[model samples]
Target chain A: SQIQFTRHASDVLLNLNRLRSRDILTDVVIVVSREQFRAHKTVLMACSGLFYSIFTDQLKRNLSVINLDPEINPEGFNILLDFMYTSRLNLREGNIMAVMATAMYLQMEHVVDTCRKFIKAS
Target chain B: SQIQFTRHASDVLLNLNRLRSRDILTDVVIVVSREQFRAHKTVLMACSGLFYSIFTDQLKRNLSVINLDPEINPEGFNILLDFMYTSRLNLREGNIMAVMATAMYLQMEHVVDTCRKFIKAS
Candidate 1:
């Protein structure tokens, strides 16, 4: 299928709004805090569990796979996994600064674009 | 209530994952394309209508005072309004590059952080 993708975060958010509850989250919690952003770092831990589940399920289904790694940077992997699961994100400038570089290494263009948008906007 | 906010796009996505179904998005279309990104541009047009609605309602209520100009760059304001409605975002690096500058100019901290996160994640 020839499906077009919106790579940038702002563009994606705009697309989502156009869909108007047809494609994504309509209600969002609007808050601001460095503390909240800090607490969000725990998401890295949650990625381990998600990783295990995806691996286990794919294995059970005998899905074609290549280059799956059991060893993942807890923080980096968590950031990627978090994006796959939740659409909302909160990250620091320093942290996000390196995200695109890592995303490119991981071959995640969407994530890369998102990271770039953050850096540019900052 | 003591509500904390997460700013980075990656962090928000991670937090959203942890909160699971409690927060947002059921199913998402996984496609990437500049064409689709272009199509999403229509969201800016849609945003004009939304903007008028907000203005009209506020004016009717006579409950607030502020400076709101109808002369908005259709594409620019669309990006912001889009985030307000739908949570799934696909912004471009260039267009939203100045989002925080606008947000800060507008005195919207929450929006500024979101824009920051989006850029960082890209």
Candidate 2:
């Protein structure tokens, strides 16, 4: 249903440089878990002075219940790391279902997990 | 402002595999332009059955005004491709302004252009 392209960090960075040369840069924040909410939301709030406070507050409250250990959190962090370093979400067919569920549960709204349901249907 | 990760295809895939083994995959749609809207919307509508129809339709209409050739589009495509391929959005300071502007004009709501504005301000 959804088409995803996955890649490596180094390569993604190289391409980032290449893309940047052509002037293509993306703005995104990798929201790993509720804990990440503090830093990210703080940054947003600091910059805008409550402009995004509500959104960040909602995200924080929504994901607050989730307590992921560094190991488990790293899985999500890696995906985000990949995107941060390269602006890519190297997701594969096999693990999409779980990621989708986690993303949904974690309330990382930008990344929709429903596509996995579509993949399963197909 | 936003930390982005950029990488190559192989590395992204490898990392994706590693994450997937631990069960981590993300579901997302690359809203490049209005044309991509039809396919993506159609699929979303098909599965969700008008659940997100209005949102899709709005996106379609909003993005219709913006256009980019493959050459220019590829630049956007590559940024998006990097995300799809590696689940990363590797962005740089120098290029942030332009890409952010293009992404905003193109209606990629997820890729907020405002961050670049913050960069400029900072």
Candidate 3:
């Protein structure tokens, strides 16, 4: 009977913070353009095919840290991380293109779809 | 730019299963109508204002088990548990009233709203 999406969304957001802070369950560290980001392998693997492949096959042997491609925009990657965590995209008008490019490269279809919808609506 | 609510919903569902199975982090058990349900104290506390009080103040010192009133419908509680985990409700036309009553008693406004919408649309 509980059909409120916001409640679930907020619960997930809170749990992600709990996992990061109290549990410290994030096993993978991503280094992008001198910035370090912590993330859970399970979450990244579940969300992105590219991440699934990388974590399961490419980085199966060594996955403590990942150095993202230098060409990937750090700002876009930061937004991507937020999306992965919260599944809510607050795309700014100025950085839409950059974020779209990152989402495309990462093979995040949801992100691409959201970008398309936003563009059409705008 | 991930706006796929389904993906997040599925992920939360999987995580709940994981938490229930491997982590076994559920700290409280709810007993209703000869059935026992295991749930996380933090999750229940976060989602329900009533649960917040029960877990925080009433059962703050002792929270191993909760005996819900016998008048509460077990079937409705099952659906409520599913909603707490997945945030997706597949309500049937038959049990609408029963579930709505339980949701009202539990003070789950979202569930009440969803039931109203379904009733109006149907």
Best by lDDT: 3
Candidate 2 regions with alpha-carbon error over 4 angstroms: A1-73, A117-122, B1-122
Q: Global lDDT for candidate 3?
A: 0.70
Tell me the deviation in Å of residue A32 in model 1: 30
Ranking by TM-score: 3, 2, 1
lDDT by candidate, in order shown: 0.38, 0.39, 0.70
Model 2 Cα lDDT, one tens digit per residue, B18-104: 432332222234444343321222112212212233434544523322234443343554454334334456556655655565555
Task: Supply the DockQ value of model 2.
Answer: 0.06
The residue pairs found clashing in candidate 3 are none
How big a share of the true inter-chain contacts is recovered in candidate 3?
Answer: 0.28
**Residue B114 lDDT (model 2):** 45
Please give the range of 10 consecutive residues that has the lowest summed lDDT in model 2 chain A.
A40-49
lDDT per residue for candidate 3 within A23-54, as digits (tens), equals: 34456888888788887665666567677668
DockQ of predictions, in order shown: 0.03, 0.06, 0.18
Give one digit per residue, the lDDT tens place, for model 1 in B1-122. Answer: 21122234334333433433332221121112211111111222223343223333534322222233443344554455445334444356776655555445445455566678777888
Task: List model 3 lDDT by residue over B1-122, tens digit each.
Answer: 43445466456456655555543445578898899988766556545656756755643625688888889988988887767766776688877887888788767787788889889988
The residue-by-residue lDDT of candidate 2 on A1-122, one tens digit each, is: 22232322344345443433332222233344444322222112212212233434544523322334443354654554334334456566655655555555444444453445446666
